[PDB]
Amino acid sequence: VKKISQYACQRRTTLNNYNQLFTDALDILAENDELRENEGSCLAFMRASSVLKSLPFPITSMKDTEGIPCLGDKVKSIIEGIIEDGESSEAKAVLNDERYKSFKLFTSVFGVGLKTAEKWFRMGFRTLSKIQSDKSLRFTQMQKAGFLYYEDLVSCVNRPEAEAVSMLVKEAVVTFLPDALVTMTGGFRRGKMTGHDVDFLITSPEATEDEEQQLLHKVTDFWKQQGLLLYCDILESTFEKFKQPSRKVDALDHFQKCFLILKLDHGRVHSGKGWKAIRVDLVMCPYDRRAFALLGWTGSRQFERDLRRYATHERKMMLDNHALYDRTKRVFLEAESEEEIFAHLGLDYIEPWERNA
DNA sequence: AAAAA
DNA sequence: TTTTTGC
DNA sequence: AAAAAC
Ligand SMILES: Nc1ccn([C@H]2CC[C@@H](COP(=O)(O)OP(=O)(O)OP(=O)(O)O)O2)c(=O)n1
Ligand SMILES: Nc1ccn([C@H]2CC[C@@H](COP(=O)(O)OP(=O)(O)OP(=O)(O)O)O2)c(=O)n1
Ligand SMILES: [Mg+2]
Ligand SMILES: [Mg+2]
Numbered sequence: 486v487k488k489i490s491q492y493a494c495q496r497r498t499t500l501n502n503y504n505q506l507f508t509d510a511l512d513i514l515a516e517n518d519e520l521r522e523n524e525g526s527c528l529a530f531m532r533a534s535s536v537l538k539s540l541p542f543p544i545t546s547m548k549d550t551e552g553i554p555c556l557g558d559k560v561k562s563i564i565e566g567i568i569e570d571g572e573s574s575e576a577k578a579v580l581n582d583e584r585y586k587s588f589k590l591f592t593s594v595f596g597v598g599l600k601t602a603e604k605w606f607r608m609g610f611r612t613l614s615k616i617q618s619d620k621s622l623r624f625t626q627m628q629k630a631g632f633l634y635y636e637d638l639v640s641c642v643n644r645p646e647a648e649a650v651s652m653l654v655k656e657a658v659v660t661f662l663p664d665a666l667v668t669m670t671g672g673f674r675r676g677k678m679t680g681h682d683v684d685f686l687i688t689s690p691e692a693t694e695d696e697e698q699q700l701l702h703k704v705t706d707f708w709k710q711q712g713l714l715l716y717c718d719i720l721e722s723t724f725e726k727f728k729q730p731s732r733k734v735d736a737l738d739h740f741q742k743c744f745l746i747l748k749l750d751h752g753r754v755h756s757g758k759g760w761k762a763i764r765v766d767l768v769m770c771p772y773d774r775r776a777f778a779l780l781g782w783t784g785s786r787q788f789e790r791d792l793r794r795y796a797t798h799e800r801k802m803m804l805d806n807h808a809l810y811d812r813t814k815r816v817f818l819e820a821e822s823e824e825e826i827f828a829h830l831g832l833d834y835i836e837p838w839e840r841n842a
Numbered sequence: 843a844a845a846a847a
Numbered sequence: 848t849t850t851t852t853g854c
Numbered sequence: 855a856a857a858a859a860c
């Protein structure tokens with residue numbers, strides 16, 4: 486009776502996936518299209534996987550797919566094949582493809598993305614040992630850290646580790662800004678038990694322009710003094726309070742942020758070398774943009790993209806990590822909470838643990 | 843690859 | 848049919 | 855440079 490929306494921001498997606506046999510296959514097919522730079526086919530498989538993740542029951546026949554959006558003929562053929570013998574011949578062919586295998590392996594290194602992975606593949610590299618020992622290749626500072634702490638970074642961060650990191654971040658931050666509000670964002674805020682990193686949003690209601698700018702520098706210098714800072718890259722803010730919206734933009738938000746690798750001592754974890762390398766991201770935003778930043782950094786990636794797609798196509802609004810603009814009313818819409826952003830968009834509030842699209 | 847214009 | 852798909 | 859980092 487209730488029609489499933491094509492938008493992830495109009496669906497409740499918890500971590501209880503009843504269709505993992507279908508979505509694991511669709512995620513592999515999407516990933517292969519991402520590698521082949523086939524953006525359209527990639528996004529169609531990501532949308533199909535996302536909608537099946539929201540279902541409160543497992544698909545057991547083709548009749549069960551009736552009325553479900555984002556499931557076209559190609560996707561229904563994949564579902565039919567999995568119903569047939571419990572396997573996807575299409576996803577199995579991708580898992581055995583040499584280009585696909587190399588891309589997964591090379592991009593598993595921190596500092597290596599799609600372009601460097603494609604370059605190494607076309608050069609004839611197939612293993613990380615052959616890449617690392619090559620005398621002609623030159624590695625970025627990020628890739629050097631990626632190879633040095635590879636085993637720790639490839640093993641994902643669990644909840645006791647994320648909590649131990651949260652304690653470290655909070656206690657370092659409130660030492661320099663006692664009124665600062667520190668929120669863990671990303672997957673762990675959505676209820677995940679694991680993650681590739683631990684993300685935090687930091688904001689302060691009373692800090693000055695200089696205090697706000699200096700906090701990430703003070704906190705990382707403090708960790709450097711303790712020999713806990715394994716990698717650090719601080720990106721200064723390019724945030725402009727009244728910036729013009731534009732629907733053609735690239736990647737990262739304009740807030741001050743830092744991409745870190747921290748040394749997490751085993752003694753700090755309440756669950757070898759005695760420590761684990763952990764990827765940590767810290768974002769500092771101005772107090773009045775805290776709701777937009779929290780919403781953008783909570784994710785999931787599919788939830789964020791459908792929020793923006795819904796704002797554009799259904800409400801003639803422009804949304805990003807800093808603001809919400811109404812093109813008809815010609816006004817920016819302010820918000821003190823995520824709930825107020827959802828209400829401006831005319832969406833029922835979706836809890837963070839329901840944003841696992 | 844799917845759905846809207 | 849052509850356009851859009853977060854950004 | 856691009857590419858990487860979300
Ligand atoms: N293409 C992307 C990548 C990230 N994000 C946002 C939403 C999630 C947040 C953090 O990025 P990740 O750390 O990659 O997300 P994750 O949800 O925390 O997943 P993981 O569990 O792997 O750390 O940034 C986004 O909107 N779009
Ligand atoms: N137009 C250009 C300029 C440079 N490069 C490539 C080849 C060398 C590589 C060097 O990056 P640098 O920033 O010059 O390297 P680095 O200074 O030696 O040190 P780091 O480890 O911090 O990256 O970039 C390129 O492809 N096209
Ligand atoms: Mg994360
Ligand atoms: Mg992150």
Ligand code: NA
Nearest residue numbers: 592594596597
């Ligand atoms: Na990578």
